Amino acid sequence: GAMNSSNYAELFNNDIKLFVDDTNVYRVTVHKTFEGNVATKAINGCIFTLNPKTGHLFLKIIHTSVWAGQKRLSQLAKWKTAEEVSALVRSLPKEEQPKQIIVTRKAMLDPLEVHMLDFPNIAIRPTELRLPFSAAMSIDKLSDVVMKATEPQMVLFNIYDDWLDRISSYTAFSRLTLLLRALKTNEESAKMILLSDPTITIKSYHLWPSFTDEQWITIESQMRDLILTEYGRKYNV
Template identity: 75%
Template sequence: MDLCQVFDQELDALEIQTVQKETIHPRKSYKMNSSCADILLFAQYKWHVSRPSLLADSKDVMDNTTTQKYWLDIQLRWGDYDSHDVERYARAKFLDYTTDNMSIYPSPTGVLIAIDLAYNLYSAYGNWFPGMKPLIRQAMAKIIKANPAFYVLRERIRKGLQLYSSEPTEPYLTSQNYGELFSNQIIWFVDDTNVYRVTIHKTFEGNLTTKPINGAIFIFNPRTGQLFLKIIHTSVWAGQKRLSQLAKWKTAEEVAALIRSLPVEEQPRQIIVTRKAMLDPLEVHLLDFPNIVIKGSELMLPFQAIMKVEKFGDLILKATEPQMFLFNLYDDWLKVKIFTYFF
């Protein structure tokens, strides 16, 4: 859940014509002397807006100001013990950025929402039109709890500040400890290498262009040979951007959905990802499963080679919708010792 989704659901109630998510320069996150809008709302007619006030203020002073454009600027910060008054921060930043010559806002009216990741607090300061303030209060109360992006950002900052020194970290899978794969607990390998795949063509002008094709998530139990094959159809990427990044989150989402669909006794106790970039997305999506250990692998495991098996390659390429398949890679080898048929 995010603010754009909230506004999309309230178009008629707030008389919004269009909700526009602005393209943000990457430097916004650490350039503190100027800012810009993250979301821009266009009115069906014109909104009457109040004088600037805090989100917590109950009495807004309305004057004759009207606008057809209304912006929202989202500011994230990491407060400290001496300075975590988020209301004061929101007010100060709004007044700074709306009066300097460097910040570029699309209209004089808008609101700055400040979120303190360290203390999990939020506030907002700015102009308000009828219905906006109660909506932001309700939306932010839910978003601060449910949006996984906050969790990811908070964890990255904690790691950057080395606030994990007292917490044990799970050792990666290596050639020294691979024996644990064959213990009695259920272990899954999750491979996202083939989730986002493209073909490359040459255009009439001579440029190279890419076109997505069907991909798949491989979820493999090395002890039993069980393979969950989730086909990711190209329709998943329609209208989306940053697809390689999105593929990681899609993988984590599908893994979490599979775990929820299984009885407790069949759920994994440990998940090993073949690419370290999957650690954060899985950690976020598996917050409801604190007993599942998630770790990376130092071994180069060639799961992507499964695509070269004709049976799997054709199945994935010809799929017309997202589907889940269950295979056993060991087939009749179960009479052989576990170590033998894995290697």
Template identity: 55%
Template sequence: MLDPLEVHMLDFPNIVLKGSELQLPFQALLKIEKFGDLILRATEPQMVLFNVFDDWLQTVSSYTAFSRLVLILRALHVNNERTRIILRPNPSVITEAHHVWPTLTDEEWIRVEVALKDVILADYGKKNNVNVASLTQTEIRDIILGAEITPPSLQRQQIAEIEKAAKEQSQLTAKTTKTVDKFGNQMLVTTTTNYEQSLYASRTDWRVRALSATHLHLRTRHIYVPTENIDENGLTYVMPKNLLRRLIMIGDLRTQIGGLLFGVSAPENVKIKEIRCIVMPPQVGNHQSVVFSKYAPEHELLRDLEPLGWIHTQPSELGQLSPIDVMTTAKMMATNTEWQGENCIVL
């Protein structure tokens, strides 16, 4: 099939045709009456081009159109008669003269695609003695595309055999370990049972993180603020370096921590906000977010200070606010009336 197309594309050097390992059933196109009649009436070899997408690209994306075409071709390949009935359920459905497939609305195509998928899966389940309900979405996709997959029953059997062989091998293996005690005496220990040979490992590299966290304070030696997209008419915030240094020192490489910013306005200029303290409320953090209580803290030391936003650590730098940061700020402003949007920032 590629040879005539490659010859036809010699005049278009910017187009490269590549083969695919997927077994797409393009031969099912020959089962369509329009193509069959064209072949029967042919008197000489000729190149004929058809748009098998019809006018689908006017309402759906190219990905949806290709998926729909693969569904139709696969269904025609496994059950030609049933597919014809699904594509034209009643005589009122017509096919335009310049089209290949019946003219249906988007809602009708959705119902047709679901029915075609059921036909394909039912044929696969019957041939391989597999319950269709036990198939995963990845297996369903591979079945429709024609990729080679192992039937679930055979796959489970192979997994069970591998696990059994590994278990038998581990039961018969003796392991000798050479260790040294605190007095310098060498000890040879031979173990044959599984629980004596088990190795326990943490899911996280906590040791590397703990050692690296002790050097976080070194990152505060060189702190810079990017000057791009700074509004000269906006507010200016002054952050003491000792506060920022202390926050970074108690932080972690992955788990986020955060605090609420409180400060005052400069006496000579109300547009300059001086951050005086960082309040660390009870919080739950992970590598993606940190969660506070939605109520702002109350303390006698905060009476003369105004809220200026909040600050948190993160594993990597982002070019903009994450959706989680926006939601956290919105919840805090909605719950606490003293939090004003024009004064609060997120660092």
């Protein structure tokens, strides 16, 4: 059944599972036409497919050519997502295939279930959590590879950098959730927090800065400050 606060610990057990977020697959800019009508122009997108235990991110880049000549693109996007997740699973050795796939939006359930009929032993689950994976395109290196792509492409990342050398996957996911929640509520402020000190750099093979343990506590506090504020600045409190 659904994944929620009550069964949150299950994410970090030893059953392989993947989150799938489809919120950045079909992306458009809306603009005026010469005749004064409105039109959309698609831009490149991505499927965000994440193992929360290991940090392994399978970023399938969705090039705009996949939408050419197609109708009802928001519906097609869900089916394209399910086609690509199904292809990913079939590409993995049996012992690496997930036992569960958790979709962040319930509209992905039927598309994924139909594409995975061959895998009756993989559970497709929704979640009651409002996980902030849509903000993945605020991570500069991820946005960069998506926008530069000229063809369909799969790129593999560890979204935890090397954190698992020092913290648990439970703590790693909590840190990722705080960073993504910050970036989604106030991207400019969040990014100022992360880069302000020019002496802390991002390694070439990493996504986030090389904070010491103590600096991560400060950073996380600052992210905790931003989110509670914006929640005032929004509701006036």
